[PDB]
mmCIF file of N, CA, C and O in Angstrom:
data_model
loop_
_atom_site.group_PDB
_atom_site.id
_atom_site.type_symbol
_atom_site.label_atom_id
_atom_site.label_comp_id
_atom_site.label_asym_id
_atom_site.label_seq_id
_atom_site.Cartn_x
_atom_site.Cartn_y
_atom_site.Cartn_z
ATOM 1 N N UNK A 4 0.842 -1.182 0.000
ATOM 2 C CA UNK A 4 0.000 0.000 0.000
ATOM 3 C C UNK A 4 0.882 1.238 0.000
ATOM 4 O O UNK A 4 1.929 1.257 0.644
ATOM 5 N N UNK A 5 0.454 2.268 -0.708
ATOM 6 C CA UNK A 5 1.231 3.486 -0.807
ATOM 7 C C UNK A 5 0.337 4.714 -0.688
ATOM 8 O O UNK A 5 -0.758 4.750 -1.248
ATOM 9 N N UNK A 6 0.779 5.702 0.075
ATOM 10 C CA UNK A 6 0.062 6.967 0.146
ATOM 11 C C UNK A 6 0.876 8.096 -0.490
ATOM 12 O O UNK A 6 2.092 7.999 -0.619
ATOM 13 N N UNK A 7 0.167 9.141 -0.896
ATOM 14 C CA UNK A 7 0.703 10.244 -1.669
ATOM 15 C C UNK A 7 -0.117 11.493 -1.348
ATOM 16 O O UNK A 7 -1.128 11.380 -0.658
ATOM 17 N N UNK A 8 0.318 12.667 -1.803
ATOM 18 C CA UNK A 8 -0.298 13.942 -1.403
ATOM 19 C C UNK A 8 -1.831 13.944 -1.509
ATOM 20 O O UNK A 8 -2.494 14.544 -0.672
ATOM 21 N N UNK A 9 -2.402 13.294 -2.521
ATOM 22 C CA UNK A 9 -3.864 13.236 -2.656
ATOM 23 C C UNK A 9 -4.494 12.565 -1.438
ATOM 24 O O UNK A 9 -5.555 12.971 -0.941
ATOM 25 N N UNK A 10 -3.803 11.558 -0.932
ATOM 26 C CA UNK A 10 -4.263 10.796 0.218
ATOM 27 C C UNK A 10 -4.310 11.660 1.472
ATOM 28 O O UNK A 10 -4.739 11.192 2.529
ATOM 29 N N UNK A 11 -3.862 12.918 1.343
ATOM 30 C CA UNK A 11 -3.974 13.923 2.408
ATOM 31 C C UNK A 11 -5.409 13.973 2.932
ATOM 32 O O UNK A 11 -5.672 14.460 4.033
ATOM 33 N N UNK A 12 -6.328 13.450 2.126
ATOM 34 C CA UNK A 12 -7.714 13.357 2.530
ATOM 35 C C UNK A 12 -8.339 12.062 2.058
ATOM 36 O O UNK A 12 -9.345 12.069 1.349
ATOM 37 N N UNK A 13 -7.727 10.943 2.429
ATOM 38 C CA UNK A 13 -8.184 9.635 1.961
ATOM 39 C C UNK A 13 -8.740 8.759 3.081
ATOM 40 O O UNK A 13 -8.411 8.929 4.253
ATOM 41 N N UNK A 14 -9.594 7.818 2.687
ATOM 42 C CA UNK A 14 -10.096 6.769 3.566
ATOM 43 C C UNK A 14 -10.133 5.458 2.775
ATOM 44 O O UNK A 14 -10.900 5.324 1.821
ATOM 45 N N UNK A 15 -9.289 4.503 3.148
ATOM 46 C CA UNK A 15 -9.058 3.334 2.318
ATOM 47 C C UNK A 15 -8.674 2.112 3.156
ATOM 48 O O UNK A 15 -8.303 2.234 4.322
ATOM 49 N N UNK A 16 -8.778 0.936 2.551
ATOM 50 C CA UNK A 16 -8.297 -0.295 3.162
ATOM 51 C C UNK A 16 -6.993 -0.712 2.489
ATOM 52 O O UNK A 16 -6.792 -0.441 1.302
ATOM 53 N N UNK A 17 -6.094 -1.348 3.236
ATOM 54 C CA UNK A 17 -4.811 -1.726 2.666
ATOM 55 C C UNK A 17 -4.497 -3.198 2.871
ATOM 56 O O UNK A 17 -5.044 -3.855 3.760
ATOM 57 N N UNK A 18 -3.637 -3.705 2.010
ATOM 58 C CA UNK A 18 -3.017 -4.991 2.204
ATOM 59 C C UNK A 18 -1.585 -4.753 2.638
ATOM 60 O O UNK A 18 -0.950 -3.803 2.179
ATOM 61 N N UNK A 19 -1.086 -5.572 3.540
ATOM 62 C CA UNK A 19 0.264 -5.398 4.044
ATOM 63 C C UNK A 19 1.112 -6.629 3.750
ATOM 64 O O UNK A 19 0.653 -7.570 3.102
ATOM 65 N N UNK A 20 2.341 -6.613 4.235
ATOM 66 C CA UNK A 20 3.236 -7.734 4.038
ATOM 67 C C UNK A 20 4.567 -7.281 3.502
ATOM 68 O O UNK A 20 5.604 -7.498 4.127
ATOM 69 N N UNK A 21 4.539 -6.645 2.341
ATOM 70 C CA UNK A 21 5.726 -6.011 1.806
ATOM 71 C C UNK A 21 6.008 -4.748 2.594
ATOM 72 O O UNK A 21 6.989 -4.654 3.331
ATOM 73 N N UNK A 22 5.121 -3.780 2.427
ATOM 74 C CA UNK A 22 5.267 -2.482 3.046
ATOM 75 C C UNK A 22 3.970 -1.694 2.929
ATOM 76 O O UNK A 22 3.289 -1.759 1.906
ATOM 77 N N UNK A 23 3.622 -0.960 3.969
ATOM 78 C CA UNK A 23 2.539 -0.009 3.884
ATOM 79 C C UNK A 23 3.116 1.397 4.036
ATOM 80 O O UNK A 23 3.514 1.821 5.122
ATOM 81 N N UNK A 24 3.218 2.107 2.927
ATOM 82 C CA UNK A 24 3.949 3.354 2.932
ATOM 83 C C UNK A 24 3.041 4.559 2.808
ATOM 84 O O UNK A 24 1.912 4.480 2.317
ATOM 85 N N UNK A 25 3.575 5.669 3.269
ATOM 86 C CA UNK A 25 2.917 6.954 3.240
ATOM 87 C C UNK A 25 3.912 7.993 2.740
ATOM 88 O O UNK A 25 4.789 8.411 3.479
ATOM 89 N N UNK A 26 3.803 8.408 1.499
ATOM 90 C CA UNK A 26 4.789 9.318 0.949
ATOM 91 C C UNK A 26 4.207 10.683 0.658
ATOM 92 O O UNK A 26 3.090 10.808 0.161
ATOM 93 N N UNK A 27 4.978 11.709 0.973
ATOM 94 C CA UNK A 27 4.613 13.056 0.621
ATOM 95 C C UNK A 27 5.564 13.592 -0.435
ATOM 96 O O UNK A 27 6.730 13.210 -0.485
ATOM 97 N N UNK A 28 5.068 14.465 -1.312
ATOM 98 C CA UNK A 28 5.882 15.133 -2.323
ATOM 99 C C UNK A 28 6.514 16.408 -1.793
ATOM 100 O O UNK A 28 7.027 17.223 -2.562
ATOM 101 N N UNK A 29 6.438 16.575 -0.478
ATOM 102 C CA UNK A 29 6.943 17.761 0.200
ATOM 103 C C UNK A 29 6.090 18.979 -0.133
ATOM 104 O O UNK A 29 5.349 19.471 0.712
ATOM 105 N N UNK A 30 6.137 19.396 -1.385
ATOM 106 C CA UNK A 30 5.545 20.661 -1.827
ATOM 107 C C UNK A 30 6.215 21.799 -1.065
ATOM 108 O O UNK A 30 5.559 22.509 -0.300
ATOM 109 N N UNK A 31 7.532 21.986 -1.279
ATOM 110 C CA UNK A 31 8.386 22.854 -0.446
ATOM 111 C C UNK A 31 7.774 24.221 -0.180
ATOM 112 O O UNK A 31 7.536 25.006 -1.099
ATOM 113 N N UNK A 32 7.529 24.491 1.095
ATOM 114 C CA UNK A 32 6.775 25.659 1.507
ATOM 115 C C UNK A 32 7.664 26.873 1.787
ATOM 116 O O UNK A 32 7.933 27.678 0.896
ATOM 117 N N UNK A 33 8.120 26.989 3.027
ATOM 118 C CA UNK A 33 8.894 28.142 3.460
ATOM 119 C C UNK A 33 9.623 27.826 4.770
ATOM 120 O O UNK A 33 9.993 28.715 5.544
ATOM 121 N N UNK A 34 9.823 26.542 5.014
ATOM 122 C CA UNK A 34 10.464 26.107 6.233
ATOM 123 C C UNK A 34 9.857 24.828 6.746
ATOM 124 O O UNK A 34 10.540 23.986 7.320
ATOM 125 N N UNK A 35 8.555 24.715 6.560
ATOM 126 C CA UNK A 35 7.815 23.528 6.939
ATOM 127 C C UNK A 35 8.295 22.308 6.160
ATOM 128 O O UNK A 35 8.656 22.412 4.987
ATOM 129 N N UNK A 36 8.297 21.171 6.838
ATOM 130 C CA UNK A 36 8.594 19.884 6.228
ATOM 131 C C UNK A 36 7.638 18.846 6.804
ATOM 132 O O UNK A 36 7.097 19.048 7.902
ATOM 133 N N UNK A 37 7.395 17.760 6.075
ATOM 134 C CA UNK A 37 6.444 16.755 6.539
ATOM 135 C C UNK A 37 7.076 15.816 7.559
ATOM 136 O O UNK A 37 8.029 15.095 7.267
ATOM 137 N N UNK A 38 6.536 15.845 8.761
ATOM 138 C CA UNK A 38 6.855 14.862 9.782
ATOM 139 C C UNK A 38 5.556 14.280 10.300
ATOM 140 O O UNK A 38 4.506 14.707 9.870
ATOM 141 N N UNK A 39 5.606 13.298 11.181
ATOM 142 C CA UNK A 39 4.387 12.849 11.839
ATOM 143 C C UNK A 39 3.863 13.945 12.751
ATOM 144 O O UNK A 39 2.880 14.607 12.437
ATOM 145 N N UNK A 40 4.531 14.129 13.882
ATOM 146 C CA UNK A 40 4.217 15.232 14.776
ATOM 147 C C UNK A 40 5.344 16.253 14.765
ATOM 148 O O UNK A 40 5.224 17.333 15.341
ATOM 149 N N UNK A 41 6.443 15.901 14.112
ATOM 150 C CA UNK A 41 7.578 16.803 14.046
ATOM 151 C C UNK A 41 8.773 16.267 14.802
ATOM 152 O O UNK A 41 8.779 16.242 16.032
ATOM 153 N N UNK A 42 9.777 15.811 14.066
ATOM 154 C CA UNK A 42 10.968 15.257 14.688
ATOM 155 C C UNK A 42 10.795 13.799 15.075
ATOM 156 O O UNK A 42 11.768 13.056 15.169
ATOM 157 N N UNK A 43 9.549 13.391 15.266
ATOM 158 C CA UNK A 43 9.236 12.040 15.691
ATOM 159 C C UNK A 43 8.204 11.422 14.769
ATOM 160 O O UNK A 43 7.300 12.111 14.283
ATOM 161 N N UNK A 44 8.374 10.138 14.495
ATOM 162 C CA UNK A 44 7.457 9.411 13.645
ATOM 163 C C UNK A 44 7.159 8.037 14.249
ATOM 164 O O UNK A 44 8.062 7.349 14.731
ATOM 165 N N UNK A 45 5.891 7.656 14.263
ATOM 166 C CA UNK A 45 5.505 6.366 14.822
ATOM 167 C C UNK A 45 4.639 5.556 13.857
ATOM 168 O O UNK A 45 3.847 6.097 13.089
ATOM 169 N N UNK A 46 4.815 4.245 13.902
ATOM 170 C CA UNK A 46 3.979 3.314 13.163
ATOM 171 C C UNK A 46 3.136 2.520 14.159
ATOM 172 O O UNK A 46 3.629 2.123 15.211
ATOM 173 N N UNK A 47 1.855 2.305 13.866
ATOM 174 C CA UNK A 47 0.956 1.581 14.763
ATOM 175 C C UNK A 47 1.236 0.086 14.743
ATOM 176 O O UNK A 47 1.453 -0.490 13.672
ATOM 177 N N UNK A 48 1.234 -0.525 15.927
ATOM 178 C CA UNK A 48 1.515 -1.952 16.086
ATOM 179 C C UNK A 48 2.977 -2.256 15.787
ATOM 180 O O UNK A 48 3.311 -3.326 15.269
ATOM 181 N N UNK A 49 3.854 -1.321 16.132
ATOM 182 C CA UNK A 49 5.267 -1.496 15.879
ATOM 183 C C UNK A 49 5.975 -2.035 17.109
ATOM 184 O O UNK A 49 5.713 -1.625 18.240
ATOM 185 N N UNK A 50 6.861 -2.973 16.850
ATOM 186 C CA UNK A 50 7.669 -3.627 17.863
ATOM 187 C C UNK A 50 8.509 -4.677 17.164
ATOM 188 O O UNK A 50 9.736 -4.677 17.248
ATOM 189 N N UNK A 51 7.823 -5.560 16.451
ATOM 190 C CA UNK A 51 8.487 -6.523 15.583
ATOM 191 C C UNK A 51 8.649 -5.923 14.200
ATOM 192 O O UNK A 51 9.607 -6.200 13.482
ATOM 193 N N UNK A 52 7.685 -5.097 13.846
ATOM 194 C CA UNK A 52 7.684 -4.368 12.595
ATOM 195 C C UNK A 52 7.674 -2.879 12.924
ATOM 196 O O UNK A 52 7.334 -2.521 14.048
ATOM 197 N N UNK A 53 8.063 -2.017 11.989
ATOM 198 C CA UNK A 53 8.313 -0.614 12.324
ATOM 199 C C UNK A 53 8.407 0.271 11.074
ATOM 200 O O UNK A 53 8.456 -0.226 9.943
ATOM 201 N N UNK A 54 8.414 1.584 11.296
ATOM 202 C CA UNK A 54 8.380 2.569 10.220
ATOM 203 C C UNK A 54 9.759 3.194 9.971
ATOM 204 O O UNK A 54 10.513 3.476 10.906
ATOM 205 N N UNK A 55 10.083 3.387 8.700
ATOM 206 C CA UNK A 55 11.264 4.134 8.298
ATOM 207 C C UNK A 55 10.826 5.481 7.735
ATOM 208 O O UNK A 55 9.792 5.580 7.069
ATOM 209 N N UNK A 56 11.591 6.516 8.006
ATOM 210 C CA UNK A 56 11.259 7.841 7.503
ATOM 211 C C UNK A 56 12.389 8.409 6.667
ATOM 212 O O UNK A 56 13.557 8.366 7.054
ATOM 213 N N UNK A 57 12.025 8.947 5.515
ATOM 214 C CA UNK A 57 12.992 9.457 4.562
ATOM 215 C C UNK A 57 12.397 10.599 3.762
ATOM 216 O O UNK A 57 11.499 10.399 2.943
ATOM 217 N N UNK A 58 12.904 11.789 4.004
ATOM 218 C CA UNK A 58 12.349 12.986 3.404
ATOM 219 C C UNK A 58 13.408 13.757 2.631
ATOM 220 O O UNK A 58 14.484 14.057 3.152
ATOM 221 N N UNK A 59 13.095 14.045 1.380
ATOM 222 C CA UNK A 59 14.010 14.728 0.489
ATOM 223 C C UNK A 59 13.358 15.965 -0.120
ATOM 224 O O UNK A 59 12.514 15.862 -1.015
ATOM 225 N N UNK A 60 13.724 17.150 0.383
ATOM 226 C CA UNK A 60 13.291 18.429 -0.160
ATOM 227 C C UNK A 60 14.272 18.962 -1.206
ATOM 228 O O UNK A 60 15.350 19.457 -0.878
ATOM 229 N N UNK A 61 13.893 18.860 -2.486
ATOM 230 C CA UNK A 61 14.726 19.269 -3.628
ATOM 231 C C UNK A 61 14.838 20.775 -3.765
ATOM 232 O O UNK A 61 15.794 21.297 -4.344
ATOM 233 N N UNK A 62 13.856 21.464 -3.228
ATOM 234 C CA UNK A 62 13.721 22.889 -3.433
ATOM 235 C C UNK A 62 13.117 23.505 -2.186
ATOM 236 O O UNK A 62 12.910 22.807 -1.193
ATOM 237 N N UNK A 63 12.821 24.787 -2.240
ATOM 238 C CA UNK A 63 12.249 25.475 -1.089
ATOM 239 C C UNK A 63 11.410 26.697 -1.482
ATOM 240 O O UNK A 63 10.937 27.425 -0.612
ATOM 241 N N UNK A 64 11.216 26.926 -2.775
ATOM 242 C CA UNK A 64 10.396 28.049 -3.214
ATOM 243 C C UNK A 64 9.453 27.626 -4.337
ATOM 244 O O UNK A 64 8.520 28.352 -4.691
ATOM 245 N N UNK A 65 9.702 26.450 -4.895
ATOM 246 C CA UNK A 65 8.869 25.921 -5.957
ATOM 247 C C UNK A 65 8.707 24.410 -5.810
ATOM 248 O O UNK A 65 7.714 23.931 -5.261
ATOM 249 N N UNK A 66 9.719 23.682 -6.262
ATOM 250 C CA UNK A 66 9.710 22.222 -6.279
ATOM 251 C C UNK A 66 10.898 21.727 -7.082
ATOM 252 O O UNK A 66 11.072 22.112 -8.236
ATOM 253 N N UNK A 67 11.709 20.886 -6.469
ATOM 254 C CA UNK A 67 12.858 20.320 -7.152
ATOM 255 C C UNK A 67 12.471 19.141 -8.020
ATOM 256 O O UNK A 67 13.042 18.061 -7.880
ATOM 257 N N UNK A 68 11.481 19.356 -8.890
ATOM 258 C CA UNK A 68 10.920 18.303 -9.741
ATOM 259 C C UNK A 68 10.154 17.279 -8.912
ATOM 260 O O UNK A 68 8.925 17.230 -8.948
ATOM 261 N N UNK A 69 10.883 16.479 -8.155
ATOM 262 C CA UNK A 69 10.264 15.444 -7.368
ATOM 263 C C UNK A 69 10.525 15.606 -5.888
ATOM 264 O O UNK A 69 11.336 14.876 -5.312
ATOM 265 N N UNK A 70 9.863 16.587 -5.276
ATOM 266 C CA UNK A 70 9.876 16.691 -3.833
ATOM 267 C C UNK A 70 9.375 15.409 -3.224
ATOM 268 O O UNK A 70 8.378 14.863 -3.690
ATOM 269 N N UNK A 71 10.055 14.896 -2.216
ATOM 270 C CA UNK A 71 9.762 13.556 -1.763
ATOM 271 C C UNK A 71 10.111 13.310 -0.303
ATOM 272 O O UNK A 71 11.200 12.859 0.024
ATOM 273 N N UNK A 72 9.150 13.562 0.561
ATOM 274 C CA UNK A 72 9.288 13.287 1.982
ATOM 275 C C UNK A 72 8.375 12.123 2.355
ATOM 276 O O UNK A 72 7.165 12.290 2.443
ATOM 277 N N UNK A 73 8.933 10.936 2.556
ATOM 278 C CA UNK A 73 8.089 9.761 2.726
ATOM 279 C C UNK A 73 8.186 9.174 4.126
ATOM 280 O O UNK A 73 9.161 9.383 4.851
ATOM 281 N N UNK A 74 7.160 8.408 4.460
ATOM 282 C CA UNK A 74 7.055 7.675 5.709
ATOM 283 C C UNK A 74 6.634 6.237 5.419
ATOM 284 O O UNK A 74 5.504 5.983 5.021
ATOM 285 N N UNK A 75 7.543 5.300 5.594
ATOM 286 C CA UNK A 75 7.288 3.915 5.211
ATOM 287 C C UNK A 75 7.113 3.024 6.436
ATOM 288 O O UNK A 75 8.087 2.707 7.104
ATOM 289 N N UNK A 76 5.892 2.587 6.718
ATOM 290 C CA UNK A 76 5.666 1.740 7.875
ATOM 291 C C UNK A 76 5.475 0.292 7.444
ATOM 292 O O UNK A 76 4.568 -0.050 6.682
ATOM 293 N N UNK A 77 6.356 -0.554 7.926
ATOM 294 C CA UNK A 77 6.281 -1.961 7.633
ATOM 295 C C UNK A 77 5.714 -2.661 8.847
ATOM 296 O O UNK A 77 6.386 -2.766 9.864
ATOM 297 N N UNK A 78 4.459 -3.072 8.751
ATOM 298 C CA UNK A 78 3.775 -3.745 9.849
ATOM 299 C C UNK A 78 2.778 -4.760 9.309
ATOM 300 O O UNK A 78 2.241 -4.578 8.217
ATOM 301 N N UNK A 79 2.552 -5.838 10.052
ATOM 302 C CA UNK A 79 1.437 -6.716 9.758
ATOM 303 C C UNK A 79 0.684 -7.056 11.053
ATOM 304 O O UNK A 79 1.138 -7.848 11.885
ATOM 305 N N UNK A 80 -0.448 -6.395 11.240
ATOM 306 C CA UNK A 80 -1.304 -6.618 12.394
ATOM 307 C C UNK A 80 -2.645 -5.936 12.182
ATOM 308 O O UNK A 80 -2.682 -4.751 11.878
ATOM 309 N N UNK A 81 -3.730 -6.689 12.347
ATOM 310 C CA UNK A 81 -5.082 -6.173 12.135
ATOM 311 C C UNK A 81 -5.348 -4.914 12.960
ATOM 312 O O UNK A 81 -5.601 -4.985 14.165
ATOM 313 N N UNK A 82 -5.275 -3.766 12.300
ATOM 314 C CA UNK A 82 -5.507 -2.498 12.955
ATOM 315 C C UNK A 82 -5.803 -1.408 11.952
ATOM 316 O O UNK A 82 -5.633 -1.597 10.753
ATOM 317 N N UNK A 83 -6.275 -0.274 12.415
ATOM 318 C CA UNK A 83 -6.531 0.828 11.515
ATOM 319 C C UNK A 83 -5.428 1.867 11.643
ATOM 320 O O UNK A 83 -5.102 2.314 12.743
ATOM 321 N N UNK A 84 -4.860 2.249 10.517
ATOM 322 C CA UNK A 84 -3.741 3.164 10.497
ATOM 323 C C UNK A 84 -4.223 4.548 10.078
ATOM 324 O O UNK A 84 -4.497 4.790 8.903
ATOM 325 N N UNK A 85 -4.292 5.458 11.029
ATOM 326 C CA UNK A 85 -4.659 6.828 10.733
ATOM 327 C C UNK A 85 -3.401 7.665 10.703
ATOM 328 O O UNK A 85 -2.765 7.896 11.727
ATOM 329 N N UNK A 86 -3.023 8.097 9.520
ATOM 330 C CA UNK A 86 -1.725 8.713 9.335
ATOM 331 C C UNK A 86 -1.869 10.210 9.226
ATOM 332 O O UNK A 86 -2.298 10.725 8.196
ATOM 333 N N UNK A 87 -1.522 10.896 10.303
ATOM 334 C CA UNK A 87 -1.563 12.345 10.332
ATOM 335 C C UNK A 87 -0.145 12.881 10.358
ATOM 336 O O UNK A 87 0.521 12.861 11.391
ATOM 337 N N UNK A 88 0.306 13.364 9.219
ATOM 338 C CA UNK A 88 1.655 13.878 9.088
ATOM 339 C C UNK A 88 1.620 15.392 9.051
ATOM 340 O O UNK A 88 0.956 15.978 8.213
ATOM 341 N N UNK A 89 2.369 16.015 9.929
ATOM 342 C CA UNK A 89 2.253 17.433 10.155
ATOM 343 C C UNK A 89 3.368 18.189 9.436
ATOM 344 O O UNK A 89 4.557 17.942 9.647
ATOM 345 N N UNK A 90 2.950 19.104 8.576
ATOM 346 C CA UNK A 90 3.842 19.846 7.701
ATOM 347 C C UNK A 90 4.251 21.157 8.368
ATOM 348 O O UNK A 90 3.614 22.194 8.156
ATOM 349 N N UNK A 91 5.315 21.114 9.170
ATOM 350 C CA UNK A 91 5.713 22.274 9.973
ATOM 351 C C UNK A 91 7.194 22.514 9.874
ATOM 352 O O UNK A 91 7.949 21.653 9.437
ATOM 353 N N UNK A 92 7.599 23.689 10.318
ATOM 354 C CA UNK A 92 9.001 24.002 10.488
ATOM 355 C C UNK A 92 9.588 23.107 11.572
ATOM 356 O O UNK A 92 9.239 23.242 12.735
ATOM 357 N N UNK A 93 10.474 22.174 11.195
ATOM 358 C CA UNK A 93 10.978 21.125 12.099
ATOM 359 C C UNK A 93 11.533 21.649 13.429
ATOM 360 O O UNK A 93 11.523 20.935 14.430
ATOM 361 N N UNK A 94 12.003 22.890 13.444
ATOM 362 C CA UNK A 94 12.578 23.462 14.657
ATOM 363 C C UNK A 94 11.525 24.168 15.514
ATOM 364 O O UNK A 94 11.831 24.650 16.607
ATOM 365 N N UNK A 95 10.286 24.227 15.028
ATOM 366 C CA UNK A 95 9.195 24.845 15.776
ATOM 367 C C UNK A 95 7.832 24.550 15.127
ATOM 368 O O UNK A 95 7.001 23.856 15.715
ATOM 369 N N UNK A 96 7.614 25.046 13.910
ATOM 370 C CA UNK A 96 6.352 24.825 13.233
ATOM 371 C C UNK A 96 5.264 25.721 13.768
ATOM 372 O O UNK A 96 4.670 25.434 14.809
ATOM 373 N N UNK A 97 5.004 26.834 13.073
ATOM 374 C CA UNK A 97 3.947 27.772 13.444
ATOM 375 C C UNK A 97 2.626 27.051 13.692
ATOM 376 O O UNK A 97 2.150 26.299 12.837
ATOM 377 N N UNK A 98 2.042 27.297 14.861
ATOM 378 C CA UNK A 98 0.909 26.523 15.365
ATOM 379 C C UNK A 98 -0.268 26.454 14.387
ATOM 380 O O UNK A 98 -1.010 25.474 14.387
ATOM 381 N N UNK A 99 -0.452 27.475 13.560
ATOM 382 C CA UNK A 99 -1.566 27.464 12.619
ATOM 383 C C UNK A 99 -1.104 27.776 11.197
ATOM 384 O O UNK A 99 -1.921 28.059 10.324
ATOM 385 N N UNK A 100 0.198 27.708 10.952
ATOM 386 C CA UNK A 100 0.712 27.984 9.614
ATOM 387 C C UNK A 100 1.270 26.708 9.011
ATOM 388 O O UNK A 100 1.714 26.672 7.864
ATOM 389 N N UNK A 101 1.216 25.653 9.802
ATOM 390 C CA UNK A 101 1.693 24.352 9.391
ATOM 391 C C UNK A 101 0.537 23.516 8.844
ATOM 392 O O UNK A 101 -0.557 23.506 9.415
ATOM 393 N N UNK A 102 0.779 22.822 7.741
ATOM 394 C CA UNK A 102 -0.243 21.976 7.133
ATOM 395 C C UNK A 102 -0.191 20.600 7.785
ATOM 396 O O UNK A 102 0.630 20.367 8.671
ATOM 397 N N UNK A 103 -1.063 19.697 7.376
ATOM 398 C CA UNK A 103 -1.011 18.332 7.858
ATOM 399 C C UNK A 103 -1.717 17.412 6.887
ATOM 400 O O UNK A 103 -2.699 17.778 6.240
ATOM 401 N N UNK A 104 -1.173 16.226 6.786
ATOM 402 C CA UNK A 104 -1.674 15.190 5.923
ATOM 403 C C UNK A 104 -2.422 14.168 6.757
ATOM 404 O O UNK A 104 -2.093 13.973 7.924
ATOM 405 N N UNK A 105 -3.411 13.513 6.166
ATOM 406 C CA UNK A 105 -4.183 12.533 6.888
ATOM 407 C C UNK A 105 -4.764 11.495 5.939
ATOM 408 O O UNK A 105 -5.744 11.761 5.241
ATOM 409 N N UNK A 106 -4.166 10.317 5.893
ATOM 410 C CA UNK A 106 -4.820 9.209 5.239
ATOM 411 C C UNK A 106 -5.364 8.254 6.287
ATOM 412 O O UNK A 106 -4.707 7.958 7.290
ATOM 413 N N UNK A 107 -6.576 7.812 6.065
ATOM 414 C CA UNK A 107 -7.196 6.827 6.920
ATOM 415 C C UNK A 107 -7.182 5.493 6.211
ATOM 416 O O UNK A 107 -7.966 5.260 5.298
ATOM 417 N N UNK A 108 -6.284 4.630 6.619
ATOM 418 C CA UNK A 108 -6.130 3.349 5.970
ATOM 419 C C UNK A 108 -6.205 2.234 6.999
ATOM 420 O O UNK A 108 -5.889 2.439 8.160
ATOM 421 N N UNK A 109 -6.633 1.062 6.584
ATOM 422 C CA UNK A 109 -6.712 -0.064 7.498
ATOM 423 C C UNK A 109 -5.577 -1.035 7.229
ATOM 424 O O UNK A 109 -5.589 -1.715 6.205
ATOM 425 N N UNK A 110 -4.634 -1.131 8.161
ATOM 426 C CA UNK A 110 -3.440 -1.943 7.959
ATOM 427 C C UNK A 110 -3.554 -3.241 8.734
ATOM 428 O O UNK A 110 -3.727 -3.225 9.945
ATOM 429 N N UNK A 111 -3.450 -4.364 8.040
ATOM 430 C CA UNK A 111 -3.740 -5.657 8.658
ATOM 431 C C UNK A 111 -2.754 -6.708 8.189
ATOM 432 O O UNK A 111 -2.998 -7.313 7.121
#
């Protein structure tokens, strides 16, 4: 399963096993970057399985062709994965100037 900027407002069911990923295209803003809550990222039902985070901002005023800040959670356990990724300035993030992503997926 894979998520992308459109999934910023998605509700879906997923199949797992390989990987259940959540990727953002960044959309380089003005300091904000996509994190879960900022600096920290968590995957649900993680212990034996877990999430990797990898974010690549090519640009900062437009888009470096393929802005790509992703969150890859590898888990297999019957649960619902609500992915709220917060697009803020990593060193602070303006309380109401930061965006956020949210896909509602069922990871099992």
